[PDB]
């Protein structure tokens, strides 16, 4: 069918400076009719898409001039003006013209905001959870800019690599910072062999890791 | 103008199943209705319309006969001879220049494995701080869809929700408030979560 292109698929773009996300079609968007029917969608997590502007640069109810819609045949551009902190999410460009109705695959704005280290928080089993037999020791490092960052589990000062879970979250639209939860699995009698568990991370704000432990 | 679907749907692979659309807020016999899928690693695929007033219908080739669109004021795509690849969130929309609205998608699972309740358990600090971070462990639940909620969904400005995994062959996802020191314990937090799959609702409190 006719494919639509993204560029660039990821955008860092500091918040109050101009976005510009570019669409190509494999084929021109101009319609017998005389239109061009060229659309953009912003897709926040978790949300369906909403629209943006439809006909390459006619505004959806509501949405402020910061956005502007351009192009032509092929080529076609959104523009946010002041990119704003819950502006975050997929741009996906969509046309109408050709049969079937086809989407880009979605650019993704990420806000650049200014580093910031994370809090680390580390939580020993609870005890209806020892009672199952089984023993997962959580730690959560929230609200840190870049997203990079390396999370470590030791025990007794052994480093573990194994049974170990980690899941992040996307950029938070409110302070434009980033957390992560990482989750040592045991069982009740593994854990129970040792004293102290320290989850360490190391992050480009730091230099020397952060660490948190509880003995047990 | 509102259009609700069904939040989510699990079945069997080989089977087949149909997903509802209820229109509201406008004359249903004027939009055509499309549906549209989309698949985690986004990238949305158009599937078809039906017009509410003729029931004339236009499918995209690679679902010929996968969908088969339906109307009545809701509207109806059944799949069929599902597989893994029909994992996916399934959306209706009405798609008219200005007029463009989007239900809420159904999450459709196809999967032999069988429902499974969760197992929710506290995490509270073993102190210190301005602020102290909380948080509960949901584990081992299946299918995906669970909501974790603090004090029900009024604590909600400090709140980070971690994405679910697969451990095992079971869902494991946790959740984290930050609160001021003063207020824990003196004040008890409880996070709620809700399996709508196994009709299930348990509250943790967190106690030191
Ligand atoms: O998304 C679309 N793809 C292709 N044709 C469309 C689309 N939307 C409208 N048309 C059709 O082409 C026509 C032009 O009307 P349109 O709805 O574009 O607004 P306009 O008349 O204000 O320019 C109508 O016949 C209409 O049914
Ligand atoms: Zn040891």
């Known amino acids: 069918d006719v494919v639509m292109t993204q560029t660039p698929l990821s955008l860092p773009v500091s918040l109050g400076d101009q976005a510009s996300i570019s669409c190509r079609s494999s084929?021109?968007?101009?319609?017998?009719?005389?239109?061009?029917?060229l659309h953009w969608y912003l897709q926040k997590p978790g949300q369906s898409p909403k629209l943006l502007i439809y006909?390459?640069?006619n505004r959806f109810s509501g949405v402020p001039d910061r956005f502007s819609g351009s192009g032509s045949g092929t080529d076609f551009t959104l523009k946010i003006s002041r990119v704003e902190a819950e502006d975050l999410g997929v741009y996906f460009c969509?046309?109408?013209?050709?049969?079937?109705?086809?989407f880009g695959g979605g650019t993704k704005l990420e806000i650049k905001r200014a580093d910031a280290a994370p809090t680390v928080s580390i939580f020993p089993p609870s005890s209806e959870q020892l009672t199952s037999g089984g023993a997962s020791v959580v730690c959560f490092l929230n609200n840190f800019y870049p997203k990079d960052i390396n999370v470590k589990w030791k025990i007794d000062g052994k480093e573990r690599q194994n049974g170990v879970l980690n899941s992040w979250t996307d950029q938070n639209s409110k302070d434009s910072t980033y957390s992560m939860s990482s989750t040592l699995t045991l069982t009740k009698d593994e854990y129970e062999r040792h004293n102290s568990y320290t989850c360490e991370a190391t992050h480009k704000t730091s230099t020397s890791p952060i660490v948190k432990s509880f003995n047990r | 103008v509102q259009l609700q679907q069904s939040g989510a749907e699990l079945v069997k692979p080989g089977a087949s199943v149909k997903l509802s659309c209820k229109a509201s807020?406008?004359?249903?016999?004027?939009?055509?209705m499309q549906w549209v899928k989309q698949r985690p690693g986004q990238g949305l695929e158009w599937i078809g319309e039906?017009?509410?007033?003729?029931?004339?219908?236009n499918y995209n080739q690679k679902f010929k006969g996968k969908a088969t669109l339906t109307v009545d004021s809701t509207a109806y795509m059944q799949l069929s001879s599902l597989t893994s690849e029909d994992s996916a969130v399934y959306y209706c929309?009405?798609?008219?220049?200005?007029?463009?609205?989007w239900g809420q998608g159904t999450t459709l699972t196809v999967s032999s494995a069988k429902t499974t309740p969760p197992s929710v358990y506290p995490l509270a600090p073993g102190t210190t701080g301005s602020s102290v971070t909380l948080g509960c462990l949901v584990k081992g639940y299946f299918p995906e869809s669970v909501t974790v909620t603090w004090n029900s969904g009024s604590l909600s400005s400090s709140v980070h929700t971690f994405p679910a995994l697969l451990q095992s062959g079971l869902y494991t996802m946790s959740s984290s408030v930050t609160v001021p020191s003063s207020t824990w314990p003196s004040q008890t937090v409880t996070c709620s979560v809700a399996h709508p799959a196994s009709s299930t609702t348990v509250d943790k409190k967190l106690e030191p």
């Open positions: 929309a009405n798609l008219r220049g200005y007029f463009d609205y």
């Open positions: 807020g406008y004359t249903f016999t004027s939009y055509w």
């Open positions: 039906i017009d509410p007033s003729d029931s004339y219908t």
């Open positions: 084929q021109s968007l101009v319609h017998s009719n005389g239109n061009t029917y």
């Open positions: 006909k390459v640069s």
């Open positions: 969509s046309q109408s013209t050709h049969v079937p109705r086809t």
